[PDB]
Design a protein around this ligand. Sequence first.
Ligand SMILES: [Mg+2]
Length: 284
Amino acid sequence: MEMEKEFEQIDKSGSWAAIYQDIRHEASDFPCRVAKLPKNKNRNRYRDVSPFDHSRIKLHQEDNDYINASLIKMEEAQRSYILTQGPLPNTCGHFWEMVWEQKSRGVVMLNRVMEKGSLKCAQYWPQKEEKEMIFEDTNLKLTLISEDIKSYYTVRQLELENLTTQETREILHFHYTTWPDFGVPESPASFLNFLFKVRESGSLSPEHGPVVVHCSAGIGRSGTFCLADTCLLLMDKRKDPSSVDIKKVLLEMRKFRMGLIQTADQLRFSYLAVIEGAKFIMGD
Ligand SMILES: [Mg+2]
């Protein structure tokens, strides 16, 4: 596998940091004027992580249309993703409104609500079956139906109800619960099993709206998920899989949301996930 030879050379030369900084230097920049409006200040978790105007998701209800979320539409791979920040206490209703309006089936979460005693994300879904959540601002109800706690991740079934129409929909919550407090997982095996489970559910298929992916900023861990899924699609689709250049794919994704992949170790981890996944899907 050509990508494996490249990985070995980068590892042997200790070049991960230099390659990562090259990506940062080459990354696109586009305006984010809506995100910077004063009325949206309290809708952004981090002042330096904003959606581009050209790719931002717009809310559809009769009120401010702004959410810190971006549509990443990968043309060659024929995949779309919504990457969003971890919801804030005051944006949980907006988050579920987005899920509803975009017709998503799956939400992918790659962090814990609290990590090393610091808040990373609001508790935007119910922890107990008998304590459903009502979002009065966007007129939505959310109930935990079932939970499957596995060794390295959890899959939940939720019921999201539009209280204005009484229509209900099933949402699958894919929660990777064991990403280390510092650095990346040592092996990508559980991350790949997680990705495969998301794929099998139909949450990434064209028959639904885009999967909604978040971490805390919605760019680092989130980026690894989208980058790995897209590169695996390209390797399986292209006539010559040795042409897949993860760096080029990442630069393409960064045209739709800034900052995807936030460290050199996340970059290395993405390559490692794509290599191991391709060995299983395509042959070793
Ligand atoms: Mg109970």
